Amino acid sequence: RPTYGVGHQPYRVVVLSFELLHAPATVCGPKKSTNLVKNKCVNFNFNGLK
Amino acid sequence: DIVMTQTPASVSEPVGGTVTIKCQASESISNWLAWYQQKPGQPPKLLIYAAFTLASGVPSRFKGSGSGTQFTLTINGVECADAATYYCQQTYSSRDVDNVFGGGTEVVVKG
Amino acid sequence: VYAWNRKRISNCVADYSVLYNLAPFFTFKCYGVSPTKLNDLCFTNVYAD
Amino acid sequence: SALGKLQDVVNHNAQALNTLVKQLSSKFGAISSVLNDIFSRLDPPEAEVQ
């Protein structure tokens, strides 16, 4: 009943479920990737492991 | 993207039995579904829409069942007047679909 | 709602910056993760209903 | 067994240090024992208590 408030209106709800483990990663964030550097003090991030 | 098949190809059963038709989907289409009947030399008519709701002016003998992937159309009693072809329509997603309707199933009633 | 769909998401990159125009007036209240840094994360299995 | 005392001193120190370093992997009732994991798993407001 669109005349009434939003409580009587259609709502489309999408539910996402993750597992959030950093090793068998197949769905990652949109951030880019950079070449690695060895033998230097760096703050890395491997598949979400910082 | 969405493809369906309709089975059986044809059915035959005397006047007192119940005839049932299966409409199965490659992937789930939820409730979205419709059943259509055409008499020979006559355009099809809607019988069951939303896979459960009876149409207008249709007698209370045709039952639609199932949700998601498998759907069944069951007629409690035949009277040799429902001998026609029935189709099921996806009515869910037709972006790139060869045919919204499924296969043909002709009902034969021997009285 | 009773016949809710289930979708598998895998072997792809997931971005949230696009989830504004497609679903305006959205509400992403959720649990178990901070939505602010969803950009720098990886997911083994994602299910969309 | 003649030199038991000095060996006991060395073993005591080594095992105390080993226990101290090994206890660092204790959960203490958190969701994870790695504080990096806590930071990338929760909004701050609960991150402070964890």
Q: Which of C4, C6, C3 is nearest to B52 (CA)?
A: C3
Resolution (A): 3.7
Three-state DSSP at C37 gives helix
Are A28 and C42 inside 8 Å of each other by CB?
A: yes
Query: Contact at 8 Å (CB) between C48 and C16?
Result: no
Q: Which residues pair with B21 in a beta bridge?
A: B73
- DSSP 8-state class, residue D6: H
Kindly calculate the radius of gyration of chain C based on its CA atoms and give it in whole angstroms: 12
| List of chain C residues whose C-beta atoms are within 8 Å of the C-beta of residue B31 | 3
Closest-CA residue to B75 (of B24, B11, B6): B11
Cβ contacts (< 8 Å) between D44 and chain C: which residues? Answer: 34
Domains and CATH numbers, chain B: 4-109 (2.60.40.10)
Experimental technique: cryo-EM
Query: With contact defined as beta carbons under 8 Å apart, do B16 and B79 qualify?
Result: no
Say if the Cβ atoms of B68 and C3 lie within 8 Å. yes
Q: Best interface-test mutation with C: which of A6, A15, A16, A50 has the largest number of C CBs within 10 A?
A: A16
Closest CA to B33 of B75, B4, B76: B4
CB C4 within 8 A of CB A20: no
Per CB-CB distance under 8 Å, the chain D contacts of C36 are: 43
Q: Which residues of C touch A19 (CB under 8 A)?
A: 43-45
d(CA C10, CA A16) in angstroms, rounded, equals 13
CB atoms D41 and A20 under 8 Å? yes
Are D41 and A48 in contact (CB < 8 Å)? no
